[PDB]
Amino acid sequence: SLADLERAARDVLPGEIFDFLAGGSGTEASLVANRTALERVFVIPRMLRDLTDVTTEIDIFGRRAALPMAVAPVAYQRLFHPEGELAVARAARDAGVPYTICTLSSVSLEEIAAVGGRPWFQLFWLRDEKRSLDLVRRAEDAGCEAIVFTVDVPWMGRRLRDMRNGFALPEWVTAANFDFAPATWESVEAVRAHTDLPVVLKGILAVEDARRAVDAGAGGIVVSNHGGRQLDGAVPGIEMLGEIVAAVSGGCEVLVDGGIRSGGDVLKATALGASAVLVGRPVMWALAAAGQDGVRQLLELLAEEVRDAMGLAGCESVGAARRLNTKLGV
Amino acid sequence: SLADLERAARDVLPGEIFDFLAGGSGTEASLVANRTALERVFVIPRMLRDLTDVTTEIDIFGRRAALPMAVAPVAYQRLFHPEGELAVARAARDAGVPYTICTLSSVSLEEIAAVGGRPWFQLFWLRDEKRSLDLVRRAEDAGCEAIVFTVDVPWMGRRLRDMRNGFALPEWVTAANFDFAPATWESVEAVRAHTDLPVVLKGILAVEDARRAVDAGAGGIVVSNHGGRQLDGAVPGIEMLGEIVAAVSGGCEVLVDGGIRSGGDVLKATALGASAVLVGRPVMWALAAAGQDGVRQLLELLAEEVRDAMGLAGCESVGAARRLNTKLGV
Amino acid sequence: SLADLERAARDVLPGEIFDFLAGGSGTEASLVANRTALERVFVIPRMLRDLTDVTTEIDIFGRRAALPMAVAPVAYQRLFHPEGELAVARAARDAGVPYTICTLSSVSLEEIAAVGGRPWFQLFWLRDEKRSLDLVRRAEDAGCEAIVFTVDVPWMGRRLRDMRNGFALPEWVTAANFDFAPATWESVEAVRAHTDLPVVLKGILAVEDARRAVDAGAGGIVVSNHGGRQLDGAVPGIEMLGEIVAAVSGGCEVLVDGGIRSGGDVLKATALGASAVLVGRPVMWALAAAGQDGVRQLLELLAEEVRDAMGLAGCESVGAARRLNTKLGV
Amino acid sequence: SLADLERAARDVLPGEIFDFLAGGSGTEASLVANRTALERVFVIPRMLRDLTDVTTEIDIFGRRAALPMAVAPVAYQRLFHPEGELAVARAARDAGVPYTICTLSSVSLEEIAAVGGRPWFQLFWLRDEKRSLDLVRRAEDAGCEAIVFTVDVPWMGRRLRDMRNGFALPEWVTAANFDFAPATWESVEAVRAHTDLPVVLKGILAVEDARRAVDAGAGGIVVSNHGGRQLDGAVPGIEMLGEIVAAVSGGCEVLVDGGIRSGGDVLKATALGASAVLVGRPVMWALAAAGQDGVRQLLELLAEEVRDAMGLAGCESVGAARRLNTKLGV
Ligand SMILES: Cc1cc2c(cc1C)N(C[C@H](O)[C@H](O)[C@@H](O)COP(=O)(O)O)C1=NC(=O)NC(=O)[C@]1(O/C(C(=O)O)=C(/O)C(=O)O)N2
Numbered sequence A, B, C, D: 001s002l003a004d005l006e007r008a009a010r011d012v013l014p015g016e017i018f019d020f021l022a023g024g025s026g027t028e029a030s031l032v033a034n035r036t037a038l039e040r041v042f043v044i045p046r047m048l049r050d051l052t053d054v055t056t057e058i059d060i061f062g063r064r065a066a067l068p069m070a071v072a073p074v075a076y077q078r079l080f081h082p083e084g085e086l087a088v089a090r091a092a093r094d095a096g097v098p099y100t101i102c103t104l105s106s107v108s109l110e111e112i113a114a115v116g117g118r119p120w121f122q123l124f125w126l127r128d129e130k131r132s133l134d135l136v137r138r139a140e141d142a143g144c145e146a147i148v149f150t151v152d153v154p155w156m157g158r159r160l161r162d163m164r165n166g167f168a169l170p171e172w173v174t175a176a177n178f179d180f181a182p183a184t185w186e187s188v189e190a191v192r193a194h195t196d197l198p199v200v201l202k203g204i205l206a207v208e209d210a211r212r213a214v215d216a217g218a219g220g221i222v223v224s225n226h227g228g229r230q231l232d233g234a235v236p237g238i239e240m241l242g243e244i245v246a247a248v249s250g251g252c253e254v255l256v257d258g259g260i261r262s263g264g265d266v267l268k269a270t271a272l273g274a275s276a277v278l279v280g281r282p283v284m285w286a287l288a289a290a291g292q293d294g295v296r297q298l299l300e301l302l303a304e305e306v307r308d309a310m311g312l313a314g315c316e317s318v319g320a321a322r323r324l325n326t327k328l329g330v
């Protein structure tokens, strides 16, 4: 799987960049808990069903995706490889997986979107509502299909790895969308009224926040502790997903991320009730280790592992994988 | 117990063969979980009962067995020792334990069955229904007493040990029954209508699959994650057994396997409600380390450990061992 | 506490004797679980009560004891020190703690009892009922106050340490009461009708066995997996004690043993509802390391630790310690 | 965070003093459990609330504090640094955090209180009720705002580190308030009738003790196992807090301590329902490593971490942090 890639990335990247990537907030309690949560989940597979036409495809936000997965927004991809966002966006397009353009992309969102595929745009709320809504309109004018409003960063968590490294953006990595402020529910309304694209709230962990996101007109949420990078001691998304799925009752798409490292982890997420996962760090290890061709290989291996895991679980379709039962281990 | 044998086998076998044997799918989460599940189970022994006539015998599929245990189907036994299946089948016969002939046996099922004893036949479903049913008829014509239909291998799991070893069958190990396709419930019907032998579905983990197996006319099931070799993250059988036993309500025999390493583990399986266990890897460690006499010694040591464990638990009979209570530890 | 003593004993004893002492059955799952069970138990202390007259004394089987504790029966004490049972019995008497004379004592039970104090006698059932009942009468004629009928040894568990050591009784260690058979409930009746002493069944783990022991006229039970020396995978006593206490409802004394290593462990046992503990291995480490004076020092340190733990928990009396609540940790 | 400081303190202090500070009673089961309890607690953060005016302030015992935190009473602060209590009290005052003057302060309580700020006084009950009540009156005459009656030390726990070190007060460290006896509920009444200051019972772990403390006229309790220094095997405070909070139903302030090492730990304590925490050992590591300026820096870092954690959890106020939900991990 992806475990060699992690090493290959540790080798090629300067320590302080691999730390920017790998790290969480505080004591990294939430970073590690993301993995322990997935490792505790056991799937109950079903046997003897028709697998003649096993398909990993889903429809999400009006469109077909090849797998129940999107590339998570990860800022400043030129930190990992000279072609940064463009290499990832190309591989994503060719794998039929959505790609989430960041607000802090090291290439302009217009350029990334011209790559084609299914680009989404991740929004950080700026101090000026008009700058925020102009970023939303640019993304929509540029053909982005969803606004992934990041709602768990009223400010960045305390990253002790980057504080200890005195890490700072190299001169040659820029925020290309530019020549910030806590978001609120009113900020969500402002975006929702400005766009006809689906608004996807990223970083929901409370059941009542899931519910309110539906009330608020979200088309989706991402059940996420931000890869353990925001509140240290935040519950993992994976530990809140089943509850959140039951409370939303079909009222928006429910994605999850944090620690997805395999196809089997995708199967577990789907059996908990997720519509799709986001994968972050692994796509940046592939990017670091081998640029566009590395990301394309990661996405093919993940595509094979999802298909393998589904069929061994008796699931012809992602919808069947959602109906699987689970059992929690120790 | 068997722990020396494991070492003795590691010594004598080429690394890549010991890996074929020892390995599971994916990250081996289900391989390890099989052991953690049994280690969590504590038996509540009963005291002061009559042990004058302690007997480990059971009746299963019309016939007496000496212990609540059969040899699991393990392909290509000539990988482990020159006499392969014949050495194991001889030791099994002389120990009064059923032996499961594989579809991928490295000696023909007719030869293995001529050894006598209580041979069962494990069926992999082939692409051609007529080849499948002809393998069933051969087994029945050859005096096999049960068809162990393996229902958890629509295709083989991803074995990272064998992928990393680029492992492949030596020239001198053949599939002797030959000069494959996902099974379904219709495949089960096809076998059930073709034979009067008991059909035993191997690889059931879902309660509703157990129930349906009874509905379908199975004479037995094996509650099994295939030794952690199929879906990585599949629940252990041992973790589903009690639920499955309660749902079947006596309607077929319920075997379990995965990680049985002692007589006490046999006692635990029986106290959870299993009719019998299958033992896989340990019979191949004995075979590797000492051929027929090694398997016979393993089966005598297991026979002594089962009898010891039963009497220390106050059980004169396997039926009394099924009535024991358990308590789950950490 | 006792942890230095363990080392001091490892130093002075031949490896194979320290193994006779330290060891359990099978994989020692039940030996280790005894410790993990006590370590999981947290006491909820009470504050601000009157401690003016804190007393560790109890009345058990008609008589006062200085602490809620007795010395467990441990065979062949001359293995650990030349004065063997006599050194332990002297220290026990002078500490006001009952001492359990073994059926396999390396000094005659008449000699051990002449030491005075509060000797109990542990009975193994022999093949001949008349030899058994004659051992009971000797103990009673010798002034023993209780018969501790060991009911968890229809035969000795498989001790892999002693099998691997080919351990056997030295020539100079004898069974002094001599110049065996599974006990049953009828054996219990036979003893109960032969003596007016309290009969204490040692090795009860099932709730229904506790209840039946009361029905049968037992004056006590010892909730015990025999220090993990009998069924490997037997639940720890400490894990069944609260349930057993509730089911007996005051109908006999309920002792527990296995892994008691401190006064705080005595407090935990009492807060679970035990009347008293037995301590085995620690009394033999003291004996090995320093003979009679070593056992007397162990008993004084345990006496101080029990008194300390009780007062820090707000308990003036052992009866108050039984009313404490507990909380189970991980 | 504080983890470097711990090392810096280990370096500068004599082993036997760092052990006086770091150590618990018995096997330190309760010392370690304090940390495992906090590490098991996950917060469920809320998103998208107004953080325009995030404030860490609370009102407690009539007065504003800058953070939900006080310095715990820790005896003989001149052990850690020449300025001992005065350095800590100065830093506490300037950080707007209450400081708890000990009965065994190595500077007189009148001197410590002249520093100003929000001094509380911790009371150990003496053999003579009149000495006890005269210490209470001195504290009140000296402008202390609360009496923190320590109710979990009828006598000091067995500190094996200090027994093994034969540790004893250096000649140059004195008990400055001087030129002891178990407290009871009558002792609590005696203090309550002698002072109009709030009486805060420190070392409550039982629900019924919490309730009785309210009945008794306490203004507060501290849910505390005394940093694992008193009963070894005492439940952690953090494990009883939620239950205690629910039982008090607003009837007194409920503080907690034991193992608070960060702002996130403060957030966890508050989400469990605590009014405020006490921090002990970390304030003495800062003191040892850098005297007054070290304590002031610790309090600024803790102040920043609390504010960070609150905002990442969507809490504008400590009252909002109390309403957060939690989820217990493994
Ligand atoms: C290096 C880096 C950068 C980001 C992010 C993650 C990493 C690892 N994230 C979090 C991801 O989208 C995301 O939830 C996953 O990382 C968590 O899952 P995973 O890596 O285990 O698969 C991001 N999530 C977002 O919504 N937006 C990002 O820009 C996003 O937030 C920022 C940022 O812009 O600087 C951070 O610095 C940070 O999150 O710590 N950027």
Ligand SMILES: Cc1cc2c(cc1C)N(C[C@H](O)[C@H](O)[C@@H](O)COP(=O)(O)O)C1=NC(=O)NC(=O)[C@]1(O/C(C(=O)O)=C(/O)C(=O)O)N2
Residues within 6 Å of the ligand: B020, B021, B022, B034, B072, B073, B074, B075, B102, B103, B104, B122, B150, B156, B202, B224, B225, B226, B227, B228, B229, B230, B257, B258, B259, B260, B278, B279, B280, B281, B282
């Ligand atoms: C080397 C090897 C080979 C097999 C199998 C196991 C091993 C270890 N199994 C699984 C066993 O029957 C079985 O459930 C036990 O192995 C699991 O228990 P255990 O070894 O812990 O006691 C097999 N179970 C079957 O129903 N049929 C086999 O042929 C069986 O499946 C195949 C195969 O034919 O190639 C596999 O390669 C595989 O399972 O991974 N073969």
Ligand SMILES: Cc1cc2c(cc1C)N(C[C@H](O)[C@H](O)[C@@H](O)COP(=O)(O)O)C1=NC(=O)NC(=O)[C@]1(O/C(C(=O)O)=C(/O)C(=O)O)N2
Residues within 6 Å of the ligand: C020, C021, C022, C034, C072, C073, C074, C075, C102, C103, C104, C122, C150, C156, C202, C224, C225, C226, C227, C228, C229, C230, C257, C258, C259, C260, C278, C279, C280, C281, C282
């Ligand atoms: C070396 C030795 C010997 C014995 C026993 C224990 C040890 C350690 N026991 C078990 C104890 O009475 C007892 O329950 C405790 O050992 C378990 O608690 P602990 O040592 O953790 O405090 C014994 N319990 C009994 O009722 N009778 C003994 O003679 C007793 O049983 C025999 C025997 O006679 O040979 C054993 O060999 C054995 O138990 O394994 N003898």
Ligand SMILES: Cc1cc2c(cc1C)N(C[C@H](O)[C@H](O)[C@@H](O)COP(=O)(O)O)C1=NC(=O)NC(=O)[C@]1(O/C(C(=O)O)=C(/O)C(=O)O)N2
Residues within 6 Å of the ligand: D020, D021, D022, D034, D072, D073, D074, D075, D102, D103, D104, D122, D150, D156, D202, D224, D225, D226, D227, D228, D229, D230, D257, D258, D259, D260, D278, D279, D280, D281, D282
């Ligand atoms: C070195 C030392 C000394 C004390 C105390 C703690 C330490 C570490 N305490 C316990 C604290 O107030 C307190 O609850 C915290 O230590 C527990 O939390 P933490 O250090 O993990 O943050 C104390 N709590 C009190 O109410 N009074 C103290 O004097 C207090 O009790 C005494 C004493 O006076 O000698 C002790 O020796 C002892 O507690 O073990 N003194």
